[PDB]
Design a protein around this ligand. Sequence first.
Ligand code: BR
Ligand code: BR
Ligand code: NA
Ligand code: NA
Ligand code: NA
Lengths: 90, 92, 90, 92
Amino acid sequence: VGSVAALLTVVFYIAAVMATNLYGATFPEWFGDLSKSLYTLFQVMTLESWSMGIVRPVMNVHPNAWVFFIPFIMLTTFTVLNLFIGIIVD
Amino acid sequence: VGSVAALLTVVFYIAAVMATNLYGATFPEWFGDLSKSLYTLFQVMTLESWSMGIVRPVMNVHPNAWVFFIPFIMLTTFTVLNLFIGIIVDAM
Amino acid sequence: VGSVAALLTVVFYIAAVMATNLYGATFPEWFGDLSKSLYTLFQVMTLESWSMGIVRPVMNVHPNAWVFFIPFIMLTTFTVLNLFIGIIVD
Amino acid sequence: VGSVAALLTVVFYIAAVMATNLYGATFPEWFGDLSKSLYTLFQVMTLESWSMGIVRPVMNVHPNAWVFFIPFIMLTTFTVLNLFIGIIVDAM
Ligand SMILES: [Br-]
Ligand SMILES: [Br-]
Ligand code: NA
Ligand code: NA
Ligand code: NA
């Protein structure tokens, strides 16, 4: 469980490092600093306006942005539930 | 589990083939090519703006569009969770 | 499981009968006929724009509309997961 | 289970007391009275427009508003599922 929470933090920071670099210049309100990114990625992880709100307007500049977001969502959303189930089991 | 992931991919591609044909001409931004569709259907699967954002404006042109989306949502959303639970069970 | 699916259908139709009567005249696009309602209630059940999209504009006319929606959401969302878990267990 | 439901109500009321005080003057439609807050926090708990709809416009006035909402979401969303699983377990 502690190992799962460790993996998620490592993935979460690395993803926010990558997102800052990739879309920060073109989309500063969402990926401007590392902070803005960690906030946006948590939001995208919770799925609130992930597509119409974030990915779709982002893809209008970077057409392959989905190669980062869809796997991010697939990974984090799986891990978060898996971690929460693990807490409940323990 | 691998069989569940196989079913989902087959369903996902067939649904995106169908959606492209059905609503692609009337709604090109969302169902224009097969690619646009696979992206939209994953989004509809995660439920982000599925109705107000997609189904409702789609239904304004095709009034029975709900016959495709509601079962799609019921099937995929069930399968995804069922697959993820299956991964967790096979891990323990 | 079949009993759970039966309860949900009964609740779902009764809620759509009630919603049609309550907000159909004032909000026809969402609760006009019984059909429009069954569609809106499934959407509200999935949570897509339940508040900002439906409840909030509805409450601007009917200020207590939350007494119907919040319990509806609490009941249906519990039952749906409970049913899906039941299918998986069986 | 009853203890979990008790914790959630205590947390839910305290959070809505805090939110009313913090953002009520600047955002009255959402955190004006204690009632408006309990409604908004349930909505934020279900995640419907939590960020683009609530937190993001709130953060434009209070830049650290995320210190209240993100932990609120992490706590309540965990507890709600944990309670619902607990009901299901106690039923079997
Ligand atoms: Br998912
Ligand atoms: Br809920
Ligand atoms: Na939304
Ligand atoms: Na959602
Ligand atoms: Na959701």
